[model samples]
Target: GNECPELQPPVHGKIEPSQAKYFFKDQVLVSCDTGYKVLKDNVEMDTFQIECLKDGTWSNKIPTCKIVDCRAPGELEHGLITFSTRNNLTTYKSEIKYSCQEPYYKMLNNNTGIYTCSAQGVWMNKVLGRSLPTCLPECGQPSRSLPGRNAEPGLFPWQALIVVEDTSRVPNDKWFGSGALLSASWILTAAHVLRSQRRDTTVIPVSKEHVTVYLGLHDVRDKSGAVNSSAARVVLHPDFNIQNYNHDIALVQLQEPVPLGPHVMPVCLPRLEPEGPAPHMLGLVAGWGLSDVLQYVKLPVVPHAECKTSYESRYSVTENMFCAGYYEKDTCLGDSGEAFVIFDDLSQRWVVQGLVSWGGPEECGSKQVYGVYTKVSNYVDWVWEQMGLP
Candidate 1:
């Protein structure tokens, strides 16, 4: 028998036959690679059987390669996407992985953000509830502020007091600074508060056990509904330059999750940058650091350029920091690390814009100047990463 006519190979596919050259009655088998399948037979290992025809062509229609494209995986604002295959060449059952460039990205809902290419030429929606993957704090309904006076029990639900139980035996535990509930079990504060000075220029990190968190607390003296939870762990920004207190953000994980109620809740993160209060806009700064009672004041957001202008010394104000303060009302020594929040007109919730980092003049009743703060918006990605999610 004479050799059969040659056949064209399918794209991304291969053919196997009894011999390189086939007789007129000889047939060939076709198979696709991973993420692909032979036409009409989508299952793996399935093959297309065709015969060399008398007309010098493959018998039956040539098996076509079809791609199965899954629905869009949705957007990750502060994250990125990576594919196992070339982005343009990504096809069925192609593996896709979600990753965060931020250092503190944490996995929320126990989701790995890993998806496989489906045989149907699309991404598989194996993520629980077919929802997009996201980073989330451990617990609590974060982000919202009540109106009116700070006298009510639920005025500032996210307010927190960072008290220090140092060896000084300062009668009662000293109020180190102010913090806020980031999650049910996590408190956000200034890293400087956790650093100790041994009467020398040298500063050391403080132990987590020595720091206690008081949540749902309105007044330092009135410990009525306050739930005292000691810190189980403390995570300071590794890049925090203590010299100038840059990146002063620190996260304190509480030994126990705070009970949610009117007095205790979490502040929501900014949905997107710049969606909250704008520069020079009025925002709220609530903390018990001012005095005996938890005070809420309307602090104007200071522009970065203006903040830099207010620096009398050679201190450089970088984008990582912002400023807010009022001449009549000032954040005292104990206000460091407390959040500067604003009502998000778009989200209809309260979002933390800044964290009290440093105040000028070194005195509470001194000359009024803009209170320097660590911009919370700049570290949103870093914050999510710290929560162990991407």
Candidate 2:
């Protein structure tokens, strides 16, 4: 026969000029199926050519068709990527899944967390988009533990313990106060808590070196699982008045960012000026006041006018402070600097509305006396400035 030996098309490939036999000088075009490419001389090509010569032989052997590869995707910060195919293959039709580290980061803009390699040799998400997903910090989400007077370990994740080391004493006395985690590196507390009171009635700001913040703590006696960070610096409101306890807010910047989890997180700050707590609305206060375990109490918001009359004979009440306590349900001595939180229904998050500042009587929870708090809403702008947030 004056024809080249019968040629068999490569698997997953096809050839043009279909015929039972090919004579000399006849040529045929070879191509691969969808999502595949022909390998010619170690290089991928859409098609290859073969020609019969005068010697009744083909010019080249049939080439191989390989599956199109998309290659591995890029890395994700605070997240992980996994492949569905064996040996982590990235060839055609292979799938990959993305997931954020739980209790700290959350997947954003991509709820499906799934992507597949398409015929075009690119990864596609659920919406058929090529945009990379993101993992963002998850904040202000409390645990699902049931509520109680004695808070569960993860109930008030933002609760912080402020400890001041008294170096003057032969055996250092660790003075304890309360605070709220505003961020991974910032704590919100009462300015008064950051001051050292001397016998001569002189009050001086406590040195940042002597301050330490403990987060993810549920008990004071047992320090297991508690994360502590040293204070990098401290900031008090410029207009803070020590005598009247006005503008009693302060911030403690941690030396390092704390690892957020189910037992440690930051609380949400108000987005707008609070309408001053509603007359009937109640605020929550949590702390380890004279107790080993964390405790919480619900107190009704007291109007500024009524609260002022109760403390008229004592120090003056400034607009920067608000009252939220009952005659016998007020915060006590060891509860200073703790956050006064209110559940914001619209945002469905717990917002820090105030910080425990002072009370009228020396004996806490006194009748007809309300515990005053530094109104957090009044200092929203100041807080944002210190946090370097726009």
Candidate 3:
């Protein structure tokens, strides 16, 4: 009696002429569930067949029934796609979502940009005939002027003021610094300003309870339309060095998310450092330094080599820092933590390139001395980590 070992049906599929065992000349048929196909020798089909032979073995290898898969979607320019299923599977009924990069790229139209793997093994959008989604550059256009500059209302909308209130000191003596709004709930600033100074000059972390952030402000004395929020948390860079003012960056999380409007919007972070020669490129720094009104100055970027010569024997300028500003127009004491932004022609938006960290020579706008800033391109990953964002 010639017989073959019993074979189990493929997962998610079935076998015809089911029996405990197969005798010689007995034929078996294999089929798959809907949205799946029988795969034999790398070829897909509706069903597969085999027969018991005289040698007590099947005539062919066991074929597999595989789930149908759609082709991987195309790349989303200036945007990203996230799969609903893990490992980026394209099996039946799988879904994918599209999102544009913030403060720069935005999804076109009101489409949610969700797609599903159809039974036909193709990505189908919500609207049957609509094409895949697209992202457009939508940030960094001021709704815009500067050099010793005065900005009108709604200009420099990302400007932020970080204030430290002290009950022990006189009302007018409270300390404040500048910052830039990276998002609705996050403020980018200098870590050095987030410290409490004791009478002995010992440095300590400032209490969150004493910190407040104001946005959409032009006249510091007038808070008519400005929005203010208490600090939820403050995070300083782990490698911040007070010794040489290296890595002087920090993030302030607002207790409540602010509403974005014409007067209050987030600034775009640089995707990469600006191209071309560095020394000739100009950047704009805006802040309320020594004046009740917000002011801005356009300064040429100083090359690292030249900047090093100006600050030689004074302080160490690490790769994490850059130098900007001219002799007559420079960031001052109150301008610490302010953002230095440049226009990106490719995206038609403003991108923050640096943060005011320290200055050379002690004098505000000193001749031949430039202001040192934290190179933002060097810490974009760190900033995302602090915000718990990927």
Candidate 4:
């Protein structure tokens, strides 16, 4: 057999008799082609070159080869999709965290944003105009405020912006305490903010390195305002309970009391708790939580809950526990631990009622779905006992 056309009919070492007139190794008998002879070793012992006919098919078959690979999917860490405009874009980085190039970009979820390219080959984070950090369940960043445009410095000093040694960029996202002033010394927030425990009573410890409190001004998503450093101390009321995930309130202690300015004004809490269930209930609630959709200044209010049990309901909206919310608006996610204060027309001043509480999900139309803030006044004695206050 000469080269070219001879190798055409896929040949194999272990096929059939005639097609391979002689097989390799010590095989003695020769099972020759069509008219050939059968020699002996007692028939014969020697090397034999096997050859195949031009158009012949073999009697036995051979197996085919294939390739395969399997592994885990990649993780899409969260940060911000857009810093300025919502036009979300992603940049490559060695670390797991990712963020957009937009300035003041309010991150919408846990370190993981809405977008992801899962191993399943599906893309995410396609959500439209969301500002809530993660529906009141995660961190929330809000925009800046006015009136305080000429506000004095240090009036509403927040915590320092601590930079992680590894992160190259100066982040507006790393600091907690959205741009709101709840008290001279106490930063109002939900009880859950003080402690986090699982259904099995497992406590999730927060490393001090990741905690830094920022206060004052507006445009929480970025440091466009006159932001200041507030001390980050977990002044959890001694009686604070973390099992329910309901009383999510936390009060941060500043190094010193900050003076009130137009922007540094306190969000009012309820004085004489409301008695009526449906009394012309229009209230305001604001925080660094996402709210690019609501069409208003970050409205602030102490939200009420329908999921609350009957006994949990009857406090006359207590001294420390007043409830107020828009039948329409609320703090969704990242707003957790942020204050939810309301104005008491009776006292004609703002009372600090609750800090951000755990919200069910991000459904505004549903009553039980919005976040329920921690009733601060209810724990005023606890706070007093813990802080040595009157």
Candidate 5:
């Protein structure tokens, strides 16, 4: 066997010293710098071994040091992200910025929402327990709103459609309620979606196989590009009250992870209990119910005190709920359990402040009524807990 030539290690890395330079079967140990690993067959390896070959070359494909990947960032509600390394695999020290789309939102609290990767290969947001900076809906827009209209396609990326099916019957499936994508494998909806047929005080649990979810769906009949999934689990708030419809929130786990892109993505959960927009603040609601086409409408958030007074006689209106709507501008056409999102001027993004829980008289388009919603801000902990937050 011929003696091996002088060896050199890859950049951002080092190799074991060789006192006696040239020999067959000589072993070399390669190691990357802190926060980096060796790439073998495109997979990261902590320490790679190399051997001197008889043909005066290194054994096998010489590995290189690659920056450790921190994985994709979590969902930023009502927000958008721009990466520093475009279309390239993320590496150590990668940077990203979070911002909300214009025409409805603006930066909140003057936070840049800037983030950086650390030596540990972890995305560091600096503030303890603080999520990405928020982009809230800018205030001062006119309060006037028109009735439902066909929404632009891909406008609501996080929108989800939940279906309940009866396998025992000929026509086994039917759309039951609306939901919002919470993550690759999670969905958020109203507890009422899982309510039993008896409708007394008893709670019913639906089989995961019987319920299906549709993400990135615009037209129900058109499923060309939708991500179809079945429910793996359903978790309802333990404190839900059947008589009053309190604690109406629920979570659904998808049997599989859904890919995030233009059409299918997760909405951001509220980090703080918000006062929400001032009374008459324009809020947008969209759904595929009752309307011939995908519908989106704008309405003002009703003051909690006023909403409670208006709903006191019908049912107990507690702090865990809020109202939205007017005589003509309301979200009554869709199934219950849809998202009630408000623009956060602080985050400059659409924040899902409530979920469509229970509504009042006139069947959705009531001329003089308010739509009741479960306050999402009140259940932040509950939502995180179900998500397996440590």
Candidate 6:
């Protein structure tokens, strides 16, 4: 029974720590640490040799030896920094860093800064550090993107996309038509974003402000002065469920539709299916999300990501639910519910392929990725069922 916490293996030998070993028989003992024979590990041991198994690694977890380092039993960087190890840990002081391999990473507490080690040999992020190295999982460069401007704007009218408080009666601020004008009257947005929420709909309050669509603007502060602007008459698919975020897609009805032009033109919608495996079906992600998490990034229109479906099955590709993110550039904070517009090979038009869902919660370019959006073509019937195309 090696459950003796006070025994502290590798240091106290078989006596002082256990205070009971010399009299034991050289027979059967349970519980063995790595680099040791299960039977000889305990009971009686002249040589504690850990045997190599048929498999490359040992069967048990690696055990630590005692060390001279001791200072822990302290708090965060609030006052000082110190570390303490178990009686069996024999090595360099302080604590080793916790990190994932490249292309697979995580912050201290998910989105970290720094931390200190405890008596239990655990490391954590310390907020008050004078110097804290940025630690994280690694990722690579995307296969498709303008290399010069990794985080630059797309060739469109809007400079950024923002989630405005659409306050009317329901509770929060109102959403003024978002994104560059796709068509004079049609503005692209997540269907979930457009759906108005009611407690239950039975005693539905009078609808006050449907989203007022506008475009040709660089920032939100200067929306009224944008080149080609119009207040849209609200019309969204009746089938939308704000809670079911998977199928999100919508169009804004421009009060006065404009002639399709270069900067102010409508970004194309899905006209035809793309070719090749899902990975090749990459697309462009443009939004107000920032390269850095801190600071409210410049508003209006911001092209910050070049994303796509990271991994999609054949069925998902057929359902328009597949797109791959670039091995490098990706969506970050402030870029939610945006669009992943792709230039379809067959159609030869840049189409809306996906909606910006939650890219790693802490930052835009995270090793973890997933782009969830409504299949524009799949919902054509549902779109007409509600909005009635003009």
* Leading candidate by lDDT: 2
lDDT digits (tens) for residues 1-390 of candidate 6 = 222122334432322213343222222113333222223333433334332244333233323333223233333221222223344232323453333332222234453433444333334346533334433322112212334123322254322242334556457755422353444455666655555556663222123243444444445455544454344454444444444345545555556665332234455555444432245445555554433211121111121222233332211223434434433343342244566665557655556555543333333444534444455656545544544541
Off by over 4 Å in 1: 1-150, 168-173, 199-203, 271-277, 327-334, 362-368
* Candidate 1 Cα lDDT to native: 0.69
Model 6 alpha-carbon miss at residue 350, Å? 1.7
lDDT of 1 by residue, 211-278 (tens): 88887776778898789998888888777766788888888888887776567777776654643246
TM-scores for every candidate against the unseen true structure: 0.59, 0.78, 0.63, 0.43, 0.62, 0.44
TM-score of 5: 0.62
Error of 4 at 101 (Å): 42
**Worst lDDT window (10 residues) for model 4?**
64-73
Off by over 4 Å in 5: 1-147, 168-175, 274-277, 328-331, 363-367
Off by over 4 Å in 2: 1-7, 14-34, 40-59, 71-89, 97-106, 109-111, 126-128, 137-141, 144-149, 166-174, 183-185, 195-210, 231-235, 238-243, 253-255, 328-335
Reference-based lDDT, each prediction: 0.69, 0.83, 0.79, 0.37, 0.73, 0.40
Model 5 agreement with the true structure over 1-390: per-residue lDDT tens digits: 677777677888888865557678788888889878898887888888888887788786557988877678665766887787776335677877777755345677767777777667776676622367775544222122332767655677778888888565466644478888777788888988876555467777666677888887888777878898998898878888777898998988999867665666566777755554467887777787655356777778888787777666658777788788875534565556888876667765567777888767556556546888888988888888888871
Worst 10 residues of 6 by lDDT: 293-302
- Per-candidate Cα RMSD to the true structure, in Å, reads 11.8, 4.4, 11.2, 23.3, 10.1, 24.0
Tens digit per residue, CA lDDT, model 4, 263-355: 344443343333322333443344434332111223334333343432253222223344444445423433455444344555544444455
TM-score: which is higher, 3 or 6?
3
Worst 10 residues of 2 by lDDT: 326-335
Q: How many clashes in candidate 3?
A: 0
Tens-digit lDDT track for model 3 on 1-390? 689988888888888889987899988889898889999878999988889998999988668888889878766876788998678878888888878766445787857878888777888897743367877545566765331757788788888999988665566347888988887889998989886666654446688888999988899889989999999998878777666778899899999877666777778887745342277698888887778898887778888887778788558777778888665533553457889989877887788888988876567777667788888888888898888884
Evaluated at residue 381, the lDDT of candidate 1 is 82
